[PDB]
Scaffold this active site. Structure first.
Site, PDB file in Angstrom:
ATOM      1  CG  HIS A   1      33.176  61.989   4.647  1.00 43.20           C
ATOM      2  ND1 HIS A   1      33.038  61.608   3.353  1.00 43.20           N
ATOM      3  CD2 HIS A   1      32.687  60.927   5.416  1.00 43.20           C
ATOM      4  CE1 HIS A   1      32.516  60.348   3.310  1.00 43.20           C
ATOM      5  NE2 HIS A   1      32.305  59.941   4.566  1.00 43.20           N
TER       6      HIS A   1
ATOM      7  CB  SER B   1      32.774  56.677   3.012  1.00 48.76           C
ATOM      8  OG  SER B   1      31.370  56.822   3.012  1.00 48.76           O
ATOM      9  N   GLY B   2      35.410  56.733   0.976  1.00 46.98           N
ATOM     10  CA  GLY B   2      36.850  56.836   0.833  1.00 46.98           C
ATOM     11  C   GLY B   2      37.406  55.840  -0.192  1.00 46.98           C
TER      12      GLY B   2
ATOM     13  CG  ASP C   1      32.074  68.582   8.449  1.00 40.91           C
ATOM     14  OD1 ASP C   1      32.373  68.675   9.689  1.00 40.91           O
ATOM     15  OD2 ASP C   1      31.505  67.526   7.981  1.00 40.91           O
TER      16      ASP C   1
HETATM   17  N1  LIG Z   1      26.086  67.134   2.499  1.00 40.27           N
HETATM   18  C1  LIG Z   1      25.468  66.123   1.900  1.00 40.27           C
HETATM   19  N2  LIG Z   1      24.825  66.267   0.826  1.00 40.27           N
HETATM   20  C2  LIG Z   1      25.565  64.765   2.476  1.00 40.27           C
HETATM   21  C3  LIG Z   1      26.761  64.381   3.054  1.00 40.27           C
HETATM   22  C4  LIG Z   1      26.876  63.116   3.576  1.00 40.27           C
HETATM   23  C5  LIG Z   1      25.777  62.277   3.499  1.00 40.27           C
HETATM   24  O1  LIG Z   1      25.821  61.027   3.956  1.00 40.27           O
HETATM   25  C6  LIG Z   1      26.891  60.318   4.385  1.00 40.27           C
HETATM   26  C7  LIG Z   1      27.633  60.772   5.458  1.00 40.27           C
HETATM   27  C8  LIG Z   1      28.649  59.970   5.892  1.00 40.27           C
HETATM   28  C9  LIG Z   1      28.829  58.713   5.300  1.00 40.27           C
HETATM   29  N3  LIG Z   1      29.967  58.168   5.626  1.00 40.27           N
HETATM   30  S1  LIG Z   1      30.786  57.103   6.330  1.00 40.27           S
HETATM   31  O2  LIG Z   1      31.348  55.844   5.912  1.00 40.27           O
HETATM   32  O3  LIG Z   1      29.582  56.636   6.902  1.00 40.27           O
HETATM   33  C10 LIG Z   1      31.433  57.889   7.574  1.00 40.27           C
HETATM   34  C11 LIG Z   1      30.568  58.611   8.409  1.00 40.27           C
HETATM   35  C12 LIG Z   1      31.048  59.351   9.477  1.00 40.27           C
HETATM   36  C13 LIG Z   1      32.402  59.379   9.733  1.00 40.27           C
HETATM   37  F1  LIG Z   1      32.855  60.107  10.780  1.00 40.27           F
HETATM   38  C14 LIG Z   1      33.277  58.675   8.910  1.00 40.27           C
HETATM   39  C15 LIG Z   1      32.792  57.936   7.828  1.00 40.27           C
HETATM   40  C16 LIG Z   1      28.120  58.324   4.218  1.00 40.27           C
HETATM   41  O4  LIG Z   1      28.407  57.134   3.628  1.00 40.27           O
HETATM   42  C17 LIG Z   1      27.776  56.847   2.444  1.00 40.27           C
HETATM   43  C18 LIG Z   1      28.477  56.762   1.243  1.00 40.27           C
HETATM   44  C19 LIG Z   1      27.802  56.453   0.061  1.00 40.27           C
HETATM   45  C20 LIG Z   1      26.423  56.240   0.091  1.00 40.27           C
HETATM   46  C21 LIG Z   1      25.683  55.902  -1.165  1.00 40.27           C
HETATM   47  N4  LIG Z   1      26.316  55.758  -2.243  1.00 40.27           N
HETATM   48  N5  LIG Z   1      24.370  55.722  -1.155  1.00 40.27           N
HETATM   49  C22 LIG Z   1      25.735  56.345   1.297  1.00 40.27           C
HETATM   50  C23 LIG Z   1      26.406  56.640   2.468  1.00 40.27           C
HETATM   51  N6  LIG Z   1      27.131  59.123   3.798  1.00 40.27           N
HETATM   52  C24 LIG Z   1      24.574  62.646   2.918  1.00 40.27           C
HETATM   53  C25 LIG Z   1      24.468  63.919   2.400  1.00 40.27           C
END
Ligand SMILES: N=C(N)c1ccc(Oc2ccc(NS(=O)(=O)c3ccc(F)cc3)c(Oc3ccc(C(=N)N)cc3)n2)cc1
Length: 241
Positions: free
Chosen positions: A42, A191-192, A91
């Site tokens: 992602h 993330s990553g 995605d």
């Molecule tokens: N489909 C889903 N269930 C879902 C997918 C993604 C999502 O949130 C995202 C989306 C992008 C991010 N990602 S990221 O670092 O922010 C990012 C976002 C956009 C991009 F183009 C590149 C990178 C994210 O980060 C996190 C990771 C871990 C936590 C945690 N442990 N609490 C929180 C945030 N979280 C929340 C829900």
């Protein structure tokens, strides 16, 4: 990382920072071999204003400690030759959130730069086990990135509990790690990056990829991670590692 502490210098020599051209740190990755990194798919998706999927748009920093000191002794800068996103990455759900990134030139192993071990296909990281999350991501939800690499200790959560906490969102490629009480969690920009698990003789294996969560360090909202053992064969087939 929310609720963590400063890492010591070189404490996680597999932790890598990915910078997109003109944007600074975006995502974490892990060093797995002289030529290969693991990260989250992602991170490498295009948006209307920037082609995050293009390898030439990235710089990886190995043996990095401080985002303000990218030119410090022992820090290595590398371009990418290739991004392989998992073919089944979704995605919308973030299922199969995993990528392999091919360094343009090999890393040089040193006291600051060193691969994390990869777990065999049949290995299970059991419920309750302590593991470490590391990154330069937000130190609070809505908050600001850490200059100094952060570490936090979290625990593997039972898969059923995980599915129930986050209904209709947890697939078997995903794993909840952190505390139902919150407090310690990864966050945006971690993330990553890898989960590091201390195994039977103290060697660190990769237990997951930082993927997503609902805010960060929220009660009943632990961080969700892409599992590693499920991908051992996919990594071998694609990398030779
Ligand atoms: N489909 C889903 N269930 C879902 C997918 C993604 C999502 O949130 C995202 C989306 C992008 C991010 N990602 S990221 O670092 O922010 C990012 C976002 C956009 C991009 F183009 C590149 C990178 C994210 O980060 C996190 C990771 C871990 C936590 C945690 N442990 N609490 C929180 C945030 N979280 C929340 C829900």
């Amino acid at each position: 990382v929310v609720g963590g502490t400063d890492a010591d210098e070189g404490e996680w020599p597999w932790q890598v920072s990915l910078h997109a051209l003109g944007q600074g740190h975006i995502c974490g990755a892990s060093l797995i071999s002289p030529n290969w990194l693991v990260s989250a798919a992602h991170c490498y998706i295009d948006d209307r204003g920037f082609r995050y999927s293009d390898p030439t748009q990235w710089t990886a920093f190995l043996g990095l400690h401080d985002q303000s000191q990218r030119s410090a002794p022992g820090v290595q800068e590398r371009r990418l030759k290739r991004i392989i996103s998992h073919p089944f990455f979704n995605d919308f759900t973030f299922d199969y959130d995993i990528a392999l990134l091919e360094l343009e030139k090999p890393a040089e192993y040193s006291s600051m730069v060193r691969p994390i071990c990869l777990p065999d296909a049949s290995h299970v990281f059991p419920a309750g086990k302590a593991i470490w999350v590391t990154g330069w991501g937000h130190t609070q939800y809505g908050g600001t990135g850490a200059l100094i690499l952060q570490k936090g200790e979290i625990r593997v959560i039972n898969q059923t509990t995980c599915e129930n906490l986050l209904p209709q969102q947890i697939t078997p490629r995903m794993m909840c790690v952190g505390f139902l009480s919150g407090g310690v969690d990864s966050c945006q920009g971690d993330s990553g990056g890898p989960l590091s698990s201390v195994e039977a003789d103290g060697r660190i294996f990769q237990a997951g990829v930082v993927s997503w969560g609902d805010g960060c360090a929220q009660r009943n909202k632990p961080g969700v991670y892409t599992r590693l053992p499920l991908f051992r064969d996919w990594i071998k087939e694609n990398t030779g590692v």
